[PDB]
Structures are given as C-alpha cells and as structure tokens.
Design a protein around this ligand. Structure first.
Ligand SMILES: C[S@@+](CC[C@H](N)C(=O)[O-])C[C@H]1O[C@@H](n2cnc3c(N)ncnc32)[C@H](O)[C@@H]1O
Ligand SMILES: C[S@@+](CC[C@H](N)C(=O)[O-])C[C@H]1O[C@@H](n2cnc3c(N)ncnc32)[C@H](O)[C@@H]1O
Ligand SMILES: CCn1cc2c(n1)c(=O)n(-c1cccnc1)c1cc(Cl)ccc21
Ligand SMILES: CCn1cc2c(n1)c(=O)n(-c1cccnc1)c1cc(Cl)ccc21
Ligand SMILES: [Cl-]
Ligand SMILES: [Cl-]
Lengths: 380, 380
C-alpha cells in the first residue's frame, strides 16, 4: 500500500515567479482604478530586463515603470551584487488594447451575469482531507520551505541568502479506500541562490537546522530521509540572469503539485473574464466544499468552456473511491449548488478585488481564507 | 458509469504554439552543428515581434534571423493581411551563455551516462488502451481537427482560413474496471482565424462538413452532439496580434489533454539534459511499454529529479485498477527494465537528433513512431 509522491515549489525570486507577481501587480494596479479592466499581461524576465507583453483595455492610468520596479523591490532584487536591481533594470512595454474581435464576442453589450467565457478551455479543482487546508502535504511543505528561506533572508539571520529558490518534497504515503495518509518525508531538495563568500558546509548545515527543522515536523524525518541541499554545488548566479522567466510557467506550483489534474491555463495577469483563472478558482471552491461538507475525502472536478458562451460545456467529478455517493450523484449536487458562469463566479468570489499579487507566490490555494477557500454550505 | 471528459488542442499558428515551434527550430539548428549544445531558448510573440530569450552554450553558428523567419513562413504567416509576416516582423535576441554555475553542477567534467539532471522537478508519463496509439480520444480528435484546418488552408480549398486555431472535444465515456471506453462526442468547439470577407454561415457549414465530418467518425456524432463553431462570432484579428504567445504555455496540449498528470515543465527549446523534456519522454515510453506489454490497460508514471543528481529521486505508478499486478509489482518491473538517468535516456531515445521542431505542434506523444512511442519489451 505505500507509495511515494513528489511536489515542488519555488521562491518569490524564482524568475518565473517574478513574472507571475509582476503580471498580477499590473492587474491589481488596473483593478484599483477600473474594476472592469480587461487584462492579459504577460511578463518576461532575463538579465537586466522586464518586458510586459499582452493586451489591456482599461480606464486606469497605470505607471508601469513604478508598478514593475516596486514589485521587484518587494521580492528583494535591489543590487547588482544580487544579479538584478529594481532601480536600474530595463522595463520595456509592448502592451496594446484587447482585440476588438474578442471584446465583441465575450463581453461587449452583455449583461454581466451572462458574459461569455473569455476563451475556451478546461480547468480542474482538487481537494484532499490529508491536511486541514485540504491540500497535498507534499506541496504544502515545499511552499513552506520557500517561505522560510524568504523569512530568514528578510530578517537578516541568513544574510547570504538571495531571492531565487526552489524546493522539492517527496512524501511516503499509505492509502485507505482512496484517501491518502502521509507517513514520512522520503527526500527533500533545496536549491537557493547565495552570496560568493559562504561555503557549502555552512549553507547545508543552515538549510537542515534552520530551514527544514523549522518547517517539517520531526515525526516525518528519520535516519533514512534523503537530503539534497545545494545539490548543484554553486548557485551564485541566479534570478533572471541565471534563467529566463515567463508568466505562467509554474502552473503546477500554483495549483496542486502534480496531484489532481491541470487544464493548462495560467492564472497571473488575467482578469476574471479569463476562465483559466476564475473557473479554476471556482473549481477549487467546489472541490473544497465537497470535502469540507463530508461528501468525500478527496475529489477532482473538471469544467470546460467555449469562448463567448457563459455556461460550462462540461462538468465532471472523480472521487477516487472516497465517497459512498456515486460520481453521478456528486455531479448532481454540484449542479444544484453552483453556478459556474464567469459573470456569477465574479460575484461569489469577489474577483474584481485587487488581491491578485498576493496569490502569485506560494500557491493560489490552501492559504489566507480567500473566497475560494471558504466552503459553500451544500443543499442535498 | 458514464462521464464526460474534455480536452483541447491548438493549431500551428496559435501564438503560444508559434513560440514552441520557433524554440525547437532554434534547438534543432544548434543540434545540427553541435549535438552537445546546451539550449534553453524561450520565445515570446506579440504584434510584429519575435523575441528569443534564454541561455545557449554551443559550438554552432546559427543565424537566428533566418531560423525564426523560416519557421514563421512554414506556419503560414506571410502577409500583413494575415496579421503577421515572416518577411517584415521584428526578430529580437536576448540570448546569453548557460550559467557557469549550472554548467559546473550538471555536466562539466562528468561522464555522459552520469551527467546530473539539468534541474530538479517532477514529470509524468501516461498511456491508455482506448486508442491504438495509447492516447486519450479527446485530445487525439482535438489535434486532428487542427491538422485538418491546416490541411484545408494549405491546399487552398478553404482559402479564408488563417493559421491561428483552437479546438476542444468533449467525449462521453463509460468505464470497465478502470479502463475507459468512448461512447460518443458530446460537444465540439472550433475557433479559427479567418479573412474579412467570409460570413459566419459559410464558415460554420464548412467547419461541420469539411472539418468535423472529415475527422470524427460518424458513429460518435448524433442529433444531440453540441457544436460551438466560431462561437465568438468574429476572429479576423489573430496570431500574436490577437494574443501574446510564449513558449511552454500549452503544456497540457503537448501531453495528455488533462488526463494523467503534469509536473509543470515545458518541453520546447530545451536539450536532453533538461529532464523536463527527456524524463517526460522516457516516462511516456515506460507507460506505453506497460500498456503495450499487456500489464495494464492504463497507467500513470511519476519520476522526479534533483539538479546535479543523475538517478531519479522517486518513481511511482498508478494503474487505475487496470492490472492484476499491484502498483508495487509494476514499479519493480519498471526499475528492472529502465534506467532513467538523463545520460542513459539520451542514448535510448536518441535525444541529440534534431527532430524537435516536429514535436512542437499536434502533441509530443501518440505520433510518428518517435523513439518514446516504440514500446520496450519487458522482462519480468
Ligand atoms: C536550473 S535553471 C534551468 C536550466 C537553465 N535554463 C539552463 O540554461 O540550463 C532553472 C531554475 O533553477 C534554479 N537555478 C539557477 N541556477 C542554479 C544553480 N546554479 N543551481 C541550482 N539551481 C539553479 C533557478 O531557480 C532557475 O530558475
Ligand atoms: C481568446 S485569446 C485569450 C484572451 C486575450 N489575451 C484577451 O486579451 O482577452 C486566446 C486564444 O484564443 C484565440 N482567439 C483570438 N482571438 C479570438 C477570437 N476573436 N475569437 C476566438 N478565438 C480567438 C487565439 O488562438 C488566441 O491565442
Ligand atoms: C489511492 C492512493 N493514491 C495513490 C496515487 C494516487 N492516489 C493518486 O491520486 N495519484 C495521482 C496523482 C495525480 C493524477 N492521478 C493520480 C497517484 C499518482 C501516481 Cl504516479 C502514483 C500514485 C498515486
Ligand atoms: C475510471 C474511469 N475514469 C473516470 C475518470 C477517470 N477515469 C480519470 O482518470 N479521471 C482523471 C483524469 C485526470 C486526473 N485524474 C483523474 C477523471 C477525472 C474527472 Cl474530473 C472525472 C472522471 C475521471
Ligand atoms: Cl524552473
Ligand atoms: Cl490560449
């Protein structure tokens, strides 16, 4: 019955995650002034460069230089010694209006509740009772390891740390009628950018004692646990200088760490009319509602859309054997309790509110009691 | 027992897929001259612009202007009337050497078989006996609809077609002890860029009669099948002008259409040392080998790596109940039959060969008898 499963996470200064955070800083800046902004903002990062590319139609007046640079400052890239500096980098903008053809087919002269999906696509939501926040333990731990690195960087106790980091956690599980039960942590990887002066032994000792032990309960660690700490041996070059970043290249980090499923759409830089984001948030809300409502211990939900059509084209449920009810019954409960038109999701989940930058690191789910994390009470 | 499942695909001129194809055209150009090129080439596309960003260390002399423009020509963007023209677009290059820190930790002074993984990460492979090519019917059909559009564009029979397209297929399935059995097609979406002059009725009639009927067996179509053909009502603006493209933003189209699982890594623009690609190809090869070997009707395989470490950190199997053997037994068979170090995968799957541009549209799997599609005979 035992098996392994692995998930990863990345830090706030990982170059892909820099891009997600900038894209959502841009979205939030627009929504502050124009709650109905149409935003599709991609960010690209490489040595010395942030490029914004995409489509925005908005009544807001946004200072892209300021928004981008403040986001990079917050992340911690503030000096050439770290490989990137918000004060002196290049910010390039290639932004145009939303395509009139899209606008006319999606939202122009439509009642808000009846707006069309902003694209076709498929989206999934997942929940698991293995943690209180209904997320896989593998990714929860991976996220918390990156958060701990950022904490110890910012508080000055490990001043050799830089913002770019990756972590990976392999858990050994057992199973009970489709539910999954963590036993122990099998393997941990941590790679984090560092200054020129600190040695591998100092770093590896700190990563074990001040990072892993501060995050992972001792009951999951034993003599057999495998540690790969700074396994490349040197990580001085990092951030965009080490590796180009793009928006929407951490979509599994953003969601369920390999568990569940993914329909392919990125979240960051998009307003609620882009169902890649809004319907994935709603699908998480459905899944979590089913688990917290006691109908199943784990569940996967698929939805899909056509551009210009409000109601989903399909809805599907997979409960991994963890319900007494059939998947057909659960689907009927979902259909009776939820309205997954984007123009209704926006109301239920308050998706014109400018909170998106806070979603763009450490996962969109399982945190902070965002609206999609507050179960809906079900009637059945 | 019946349920719905939806998958999508996109055409060769979809702006994300343009980027994947350019990234792999660049990879192939390098590999033609230097089989050991280290390539991490991201492409970004917006109105009038292809930008290459990333890291390449290679002995090749590559003319990026020519490689990019030839790729765009092949796709079919050859005139300002279509929204994009290979002859007159801007090609910008922001390429630097691979980070020395990565190089030293991954491959420098290492025996090829013992090279380290080029990054950490997790990857999955999937196979299903529901089609002869061991792929989900949903995505096979979605891919074939896009291929049919490109065929009828190129042969001049529907000359109003442009290169940018998306399709989506919802299939109604039943199940038998974890295997899935297609019944019928529930819903089809097709959106394709078109010229100013053709009307919606002409397009919708052609899409049903010349595209859908030429691809989808009549036994799957009935009076209840739902058709969303040009559902936005107008799609004259398209390609990068309509929507920014980036490499690695169609990773579910590239794989299993929502089925199975995904570890998050993109394929295009990366040489074999990037396990995001090589280990995903190997995992597909494993999965297909298990199904074609008669050990299971469907299977999912996870692997994971640490940067600088050759052997995988974890391997896991999920057979959906479709084997008499336990997942533990299947895992033992995999471990006895496969060596998933990247420096061995490269030999088994011939991954220095410049065939990558051919993988970058219509999915990486289930086509053309690439090495990862030729089952390995198993000993057990
Ligand atoms: C290893 S790089 C990907 C491969 C890279 N594009 C290349 O040119 O080989 C991916 C991520 O790993 C991390 N990374 C960068 N340099 C690293 C190093 N020297 N050691 C470990 N991880 C590193 C960063 O988070 C980076 O975004
Ligand atoms: C709908 S666009 C995504 C949203 C867009 N970024 C925006 O500004 O709203 C995504 C993809 O859909 C397709 N598309 C573009 N314009 C379209 C239209 N007018 N009708 C239907 N599909 C369209 C293209 O394949 C494009 O890459
Ligand atoms: C019933 C306990 N269990 C085991 C697994 C699993 N659930 C699961 O959901 N998944 C899973 C994760 C994501 C997508 N499909 C299945 C597994 C995947 C792999 Cl490769 C190996 C084992 C499992
Ligand atoms: C046993 C027949 N069956 C039904 C499903 C399924 N297999 C499956 O693998 N998946 C599936 C796909 C991808 C990841 N995990 C499960 C389903 C997913 C959803 Cl949302 C609904 C139904 C299924
Ligand atoms: Cl990465
Ligand atoms: Cl898209």
């Amino acid at each position: 019955g035992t098996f392994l499963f692995t998930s990863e996470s990345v830090g706030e200064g990982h170059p892909d995650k820099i891009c997600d955070q900038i894209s959502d800083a841009v979205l939030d800046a627009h929504l502050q002034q124009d709650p109905d902004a149409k935003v599709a903002c991609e960010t690209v990062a490489k040595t010395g460069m942030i490029l914004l590319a995409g489509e925005i139609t908005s009544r807001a007046a946004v200072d892209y230089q300021k928004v981008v640079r403040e986001a990079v400052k917050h992340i911690g890239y503030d000096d050439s010694s770290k490989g990137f500096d918000y004060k002196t980098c290049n910010v390039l903008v290639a932004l145009e209006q939303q395509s009139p053809d899209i606008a006319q087919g999606v939202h122009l002269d439509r009642n808000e509740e009846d707006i069309g999906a902003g694209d076709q696509g498929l989206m999934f939501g997942y929940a698991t009772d293995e943690t209180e926040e209904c997320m896989p333990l593998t990714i929860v731990l991976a996220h918390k390891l990156n958060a701990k690195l950022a904490e110890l960087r910012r508080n000055g106790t490990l001043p050799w740390l830089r913002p770019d980091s990756k972590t990976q956690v392999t858990v050994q599980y057992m199973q009970d009628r489709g539910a999954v039960l963590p036993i122990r942590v099998h393997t941990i990887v941590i790679s984090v950018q560092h200054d020129e002066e600190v040695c591998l032994d100092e770093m590896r000792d700190a990563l074990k004692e001040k990072v892993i032990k501060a995050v992972v309960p001792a009951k999951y660690l034993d003599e057999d646990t495998i540690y790969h700490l700074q396994p490349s041996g040197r990580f001085v070059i990092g951030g965009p200088q080490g590796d180009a970043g793009l928006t929407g290249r951490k979509i599994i980090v953003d969601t369920y760490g390999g568990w569940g499923a993914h329909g392919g759409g990125a979240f960051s830089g998009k307003d609620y009319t882009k169902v890649d984001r809004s319907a994935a948030y709603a699908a998480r809300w459905v899944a979590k509602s089913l688990v917290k409502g006691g109908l199943c211990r784990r569940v996967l939900v698929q939805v899909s859309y056509a551009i210009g059509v409000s109601h989903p084209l399909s809805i599907s449920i997979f409960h991994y054997g963890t319900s007494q009810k059939s998947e057909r019954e659960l689907l009927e409960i979902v259909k009776k309790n939820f309205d997954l038109r984007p123009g209704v999701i926006v109301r239920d989940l308050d998706l014109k509110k400018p909170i998106y930058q806070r979603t763009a690191a450490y996962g969109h789910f399982g945190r902070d009691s965002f609206p999609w994390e507050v179960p809906k009470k079900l009637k059945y």
